Subunit: 348 residues, 4 copies
Amino acid sequence: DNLSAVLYKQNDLRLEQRPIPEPKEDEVLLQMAYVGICGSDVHYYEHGRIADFIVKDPMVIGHEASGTVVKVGKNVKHLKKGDRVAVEPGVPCRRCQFCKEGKYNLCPDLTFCATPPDDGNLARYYVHAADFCHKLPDNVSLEEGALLEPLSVGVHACRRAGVQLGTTVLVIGAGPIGLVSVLAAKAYGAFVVCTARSPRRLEVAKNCGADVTLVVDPAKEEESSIIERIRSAIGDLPNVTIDCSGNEKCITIGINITRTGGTLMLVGMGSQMVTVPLVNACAREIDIKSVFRYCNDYPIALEMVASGRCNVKQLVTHSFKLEQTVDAFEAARKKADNTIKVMISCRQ
Amino acid sequence: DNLSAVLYKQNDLRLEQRPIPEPKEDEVLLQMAYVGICGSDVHYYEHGRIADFIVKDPMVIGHEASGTVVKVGKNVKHLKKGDRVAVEPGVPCRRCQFCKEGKYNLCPDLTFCATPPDDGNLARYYVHAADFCHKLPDNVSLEEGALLEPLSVGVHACRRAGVQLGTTVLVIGAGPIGLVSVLAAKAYGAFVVCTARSPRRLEVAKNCGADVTLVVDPAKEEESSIIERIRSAIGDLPNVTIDCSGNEKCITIGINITRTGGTLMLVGMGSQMVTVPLVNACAREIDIKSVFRYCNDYPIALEMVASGRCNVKQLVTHSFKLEQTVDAFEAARKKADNTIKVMISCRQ
Amino acid sequence: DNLSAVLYKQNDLRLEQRPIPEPKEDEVLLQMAYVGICGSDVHYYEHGRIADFIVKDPMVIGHEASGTVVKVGKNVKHLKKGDRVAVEPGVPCRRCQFCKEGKYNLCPDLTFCATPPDDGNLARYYVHAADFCHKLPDNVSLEEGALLEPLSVGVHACRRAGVQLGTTVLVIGAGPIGLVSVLAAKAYGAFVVCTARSPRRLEVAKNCGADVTLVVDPAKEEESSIIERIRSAIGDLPNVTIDCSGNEKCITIGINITRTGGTLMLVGMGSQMVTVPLVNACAREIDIKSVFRYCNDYPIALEMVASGRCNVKQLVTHSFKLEQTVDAFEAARKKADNTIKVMISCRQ
Amino acid sequence: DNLSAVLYKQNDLRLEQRPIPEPKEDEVLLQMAYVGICGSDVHYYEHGRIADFIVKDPMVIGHEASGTVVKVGKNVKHLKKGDRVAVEPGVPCRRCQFCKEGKYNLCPDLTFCATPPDDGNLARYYVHAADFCHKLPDNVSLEEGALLEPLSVGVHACRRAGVQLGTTVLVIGAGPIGLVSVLAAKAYGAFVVCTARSPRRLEVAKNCGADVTLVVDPAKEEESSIIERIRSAIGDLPNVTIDCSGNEKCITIGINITRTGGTLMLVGMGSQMVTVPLVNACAREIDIKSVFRYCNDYPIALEMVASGRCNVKQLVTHSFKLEQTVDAFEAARKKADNTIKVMISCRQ
Ligand SMILES: [Zn+2]
Ligand SMILES: [Zn+2]
Ligand SMILES: [Zn+2]
Ligand SMILES: [Zn+2]
Ligand SMILES: [Zn+2]
Ligand SMILES: [Zn+2]
Ligand SMILES: [Zn+2]
Ligand SMILES: [Zn+2]
């Protein structure tokens, strides 16, 4: 009654039983409900490593989740049995200078679900620090709670860039990260332009609230005309550009289309190296800021969904049961135009 | 009695008379004293253009200056005849959103001395907006005032990075910009490490107050060992790195040696494109910020020199009279190990 | 054809002709349309002085206005004849450290319309610096443009307090300033609670979007129960309280009800001295910040009205023609429960 | 061998044995060395309560301390036996929104040494969370480490006000808090003016680095002339005023002498209520900010002492052994002109 998706090494993902975990003083036991998957899980799956972070031993996969509190540790007072929660996957050490200064996402001893060597939550049951489980209101479904993990990445990128009323935001890309950036940016009051290769997801981008959408593929069109097309579609240049592609041509465009004194947020995760025109950035004081997951963003993401400002449910294109996890990853690995977010439900 | 250094086109710099300018209501007439020169002047000189900013018509050269107030326009009340001033070369429009928001260095109608089409001040006489002429105290010489222009670039880079007590700063390069960054960073209370190719200027860097200096040449040594050498020379990684080289290997190092959550300030001015590991920056939220000249930095630079925190005079390696301007530029163009800052004196 | 409302001294407000002004190089000539009035105008009217700022000589009254461009000075390029604009009344010197740093509302040589000795715009014609006249879009009426002056005070208070998604704001008072704070705070994504004496304006506060309203009169109810009533009406304590009353009992409440680490924005303008519990503020690091008019807030106010986020037109309770100015001031002086904002139209 | 100073109730402070504490997994056992005392300890002593924080049961007194690591809990890796440390007395819950956001000094479940109901460290032995014990360098004595607690209050006040090069700081009062503010402000590069009643401590203020000192007693001289005396002693008005007195006349002065757009930091801890001219603050956007202890300030305080920027040892006017604690408190209670900081040494 605790089937779990265990990754043994590249391409060896096995669905097998695991003992049911027991909650420490400060933790809660969760009966998982939904678990979304992203490129990061897929990458661990194909190559058995997503960086210098290598899967040396079998590791439960999964980090975008929600579930119901079944049991709580002694000192847990804010959550009780039956509470529905979204799981913020990164639990920091709470004692280094990064945690004391409010930057726990940069904690060096951070334990992040499904980042070797720490087990994820694509299982029937999971134990997690209580302070990182956000109680959900009656009008927010468990599925929506699972989507708070990627929406928080968008919230984090908006907050680091200072997105607000009067900001014009250009989101490059319309895959899931680009779409949550549209949602977060619109929720923050920005005017948003969304650029992408697929006319189909630009359609979702529009339903997400993008004010202007443009079919753009820098592999086909020159950068110069892509830029003018974008400049002509709006007033001034965007003062915040969010690159969700990691692609150097897109980053070069981001740098060249961003308004003087504005910012380019890197959320994509490039190849390894990119050849870019940093000189152009300096000449107009464009700042280039990285976004790494989230920090105290979950509560805002939850408020965006709870108040009705962000429909994140429309992001789920495919749904699979835990037994079909491998099929789920395949659907995620293929990345078809009709594929946005792949979701795995866990209740038996 | 108004000899001026006029640049007609690439390599055609002529020393000739110009009429003596007349001060408008808000300006003052200056009898120039000292004018420093930098790579930017040299570049205009060799190629007749320093970007898309091309010298289409003859232009007086020079932008790092000081001088004495000779005459003042009607509405000028804070400066009077005989006052010694440092000239902040960029005068903004004072009416766009960048100027109203306190970012006048980004004003689109900024007129910067010796940036085509605006005339510089390497002449005997020069007229300039009074509010951009900073009165000097008795203990700050006119020569020191001329050096406030490049010191302000260092102040600007420190302030944009938030350099302060507890900050560890790594300055890559020991040419003039690297040296003012050392001076500004030490004046802000930072612990500074300075890296460069020439053992001779690292010697000046040390006299500037650098706490640690290292001979480093990424054209010879691998990045990996350069990094360890730097990591071993100090405690934690520098949380602020100031690249003064524009070189991609140095920027790659900057990105890889900077502490998580820290910042890489771009002050160098690269070639055109650089191949860099932006992905590595994102994985640790390193921000990359550009520094473009200065903004409300002059008064701080002046206070650093006036209070004795920064000896900028030691930066002048060569001194020439206005008549020897071409020789001055040649000394600047050659860039010998013994050459730091070349200064031209203007009083007859 | 240039009737103007001239204040000669306390209680001596005369409607008389003035010559039609002529636009300097950087100004535009406006055919006024609407002019709102506030307590500040009324106070000048009753006492002939609103501080140490005393009306020594006759002064045209009025500072919350809009109008149509009739003629433009030589160098004016962004505005042309026929353009509809909102008039930002404070024009700074553009050359002191406050203006260079982006704090022009604190400029010491600020000239503010209807603040002795500077003439206001309650006249048929008025000349004003072009960069302080904000062009209006087709869907924003001239009347709405006149209301951008008080809405900007609310925007300024929200921005100085950092109001945003997740902020809970308590606005004390439901007179005009309290109402624009509700509008601005809701436009910024905050959850808003509004407290006031009059059940009738709390009704407007609700239509303005306040999430919770409470009849509160500290002259009748003890502070302790007022607080609990407020605490019980919402979740956590408001992290931003905006006092729009200047009253010491209300400020004391603000200090005691504000969440630890939160902020109390002073926008009211007290009597002279107030007896308050600053000690209580310190014990929980409550910051107390003043709001003085606005700074680069107009464009945001305009965007709030243009995009439909703020209905400011519902604020006008009374409308009078220029000929009935004295009646307008009387309606403003009386301050009846049905009186919010009194507006004077200027077109003949 | 574990004598401890136990406060039973107002005026009943007994020196008696306590069992030697045992270190949990994350704590260390300290053999105390020095413990400074302040008004807060004295107040608990005289009235048996320092607010709504009342001493209901016997409580070990003391919170400004240092000592040597004798034993360490299992998971403690950064500190080892024999290490000399300064004890940061407030240990937060590490799980609320204040701790996650980097504001742990505002944690609601903060346990602060000698704040009922939590025991202090004026004893021979004491156990404390390891991450809140800052290792001292060879050139920083244990006595200096005990003084890092009040110096951190000064660091905290400077950082919250943004004290830096170019800041002019006015410190009102020259008791211990005023003196550490002088030290911290000078260490941050500010120009400092210090005002106080006693000519003798102004002498220490000067040795602390104050640039200007003035004998001022608002109980004798009118506010108006106190202000002019201060204005005439420096250039512009101080942009940061640090009130260390809590006295309403001093706060009124602070508000009236502070530069427009500047800040008044409240560090004193007033009576209960103060009658102040908040209206004057609003008219010039003076912000009033509270300082509550410290947050991530200890490392900076330590660096100020370790690098030689702050001589805090000169602050100790009286030294007593643990056996003479009552005499120590009496010396602190009397507050003579020759009394600054009273220190109690603990090693047998
Ligand atoms: Zn993911
Ligand atoms: Zn940590
Ligand atoms: Zn230069
Ligand atoms: Zn401008
Ligand atoms: Zn008004
Ligand atoms: Zn000004
Ligand atoms: Zn104390
Ligand atoms: Zn806490």
